Amino acid sequence: HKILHRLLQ
Amino acid sequence: DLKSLAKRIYEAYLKNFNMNKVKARVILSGPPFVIHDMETLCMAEKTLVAKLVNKEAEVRIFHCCQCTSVETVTELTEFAKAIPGFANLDLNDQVTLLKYGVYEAIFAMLSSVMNKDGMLVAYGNGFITREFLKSLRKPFCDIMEPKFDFAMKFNALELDDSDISLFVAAIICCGDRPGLLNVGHIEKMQEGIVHVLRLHLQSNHPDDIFLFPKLLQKMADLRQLVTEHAQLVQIIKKTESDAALHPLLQEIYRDMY
Ligand SMILES: CSc1ccc(C(=O)/C=C/c2cc(C)c(OC(C)(C)C(=O)O)c(C)c2)cc1
């Protein structure tokens, strides 16, 4: 989930 | 105090979502371009998604739907970041909560732009009719009709945005999602949001003394709607080459149900 994980960073 | 948690969640909803129910109802009350047939779909495409226009109409529409979803996922991530307590969770649990919650929240919020004849699209600038969507070739005509059926009954509850913001927070802050690391902390976060939702409904809807258990049931209905939607999306991806799936959405569906 690299896009979610970046969206949340 | 709890009234302030409710207000903070509502404020975060008004700030992070481009569409809300007040805005949608103003537009739906009479200006949106009406898409009711192939001619008007092609016209709206040239005015509102000009760059997009050339596979079959149904595949172009499905591409537009995905662009809408990707945008709403981004709005939901920011809204979630603004939910008091969420940002203290483990980053991996934040991802898990959003992965399972976003489509439940998407279809709940979609009800605000739907009526029995159609739905607002393209940031309130188009209105696509429910009968036009039913007219598309299979399987694309099977996507939206269960969402309209859900929305007509959801809209009959006459919630406002202060209710819906708490309901969407409760969907997100859900302790029984698969793969959670700190279930206990999420359950307490959820209990606090559900507590605020319960009290808010009692205050805002004194006329409907079962509204809270009705909404708990809608939450379960949405989980089933999402499972069924994900199944249809998988059928489309496997049986339709022109209908590739955006990477963020593939990531969300992957190992979901
Ligand atoms: C300019 S034409 C037009 C624009 C917008 C809409 C629309 O609101 C979309 C509703 C809608 C449609 C679909 C297929 C959908 O599933 C996709 C995107 C694959 C997914 O993310 O799972 C979702 C979650 C929502 C329809 C037509």
Numbering used by the authors:
A (entry chain B): 687 to 695
B (entry chain A): 202 to 231, 237 to 259, 265 to 468
The authors write:
PPARs belong to the nuclear receptor superfamily and the ligand-activated transcription factors; they exist in three subtypes in mammals (namely, PPARα, PPARβ/δ, and PPARγ) with considerable amino acid identity (54–71% in humans). The ligand-bound activated forms of PPARs are stabilized by associations with specific coactivators, thereby enabling the regulation of specific gene expression. The carboxylic groups of the PPAR ligands are known to stabilize the AF-2 helix 12 through hydrogen bonds (red dotted lines) and electrostatic interactions (blue dotted lines) with the four surrounding consensus amino acids: Ser280/Tyr314/His440/Tyr464 in PPARα-LBD, Thr253/His287/His413/Tyr437 in PPARδ-LBD, and Ser289/His323/His449/Tyr473 in PPARγ-LBD. When compared to the LBPs of other nuclear receptors that have 600–1100 Å3 cavities, the LBPs of PPARα/δ/γ have relatively large (1300–1440 Å3) cavities that are able to accept 1–4 ligand molecules.
The PPARα-LBD–elafibranor cocrystals were obtained by soaking the PPARα-LBD–clofibric acid–SRC1 cocrystals in a buffer containing elafibranor. X-ray diffraction analyses revealed the monomeric structure with a single elafibranor and SRC1. Unexpectedly, the PPARα/δ dual agonist elafibranor activated all PPAR subtypes with potencies (EC50) of 388 nM (for α) < 2.12 µM (for γ) < 3.13 µM (for δ) and efficacies of 38.5% (for α/γ) > 14.8% (for δ), thereby acting like a PPARα/γ dual agonist. Although elafibranor recruited PGC1α to all PPARα/δ/γ-LBD structures with similar potencies and efficacies, it recruited SRC1 with a higher potency and efficacy to PPARα-LBD (4.95 µM and 59.2%) than to PPARδ/γ-LBD. In contrast, elafibranor did not significantly alter the Tm values in the PPARα/δ/γ-LBD complexes. Interestingly, the impact of elafibranor on the thermal stability of PPARα/δ/γ-LBD was much weaker than that of other ligands. Regrettably, we failed to obtain PPARδ/γ-LBD–elafibranor cocrystals, although elafibranor did activate PPARδ/γ to some extent. Therefore, it might be difficult for elafibranor to form stable complexes with any of the PPAR subtypes, especially with PPARδ/γ, and to induce enough clinical impact in some cases (e.g., NASH). Further clinical trials have suggested that elafibranor can improve peripheral and hepatic insulin sensitivity. As its EC50 values for PPARα/δ/γ-LBD were in small ranges (0.4–3 µM in Figure 1D and 5–16 µM in Figure 2E,F), elafibranor in clinical doses seems to be able to activate all PPAR subtypes at once.
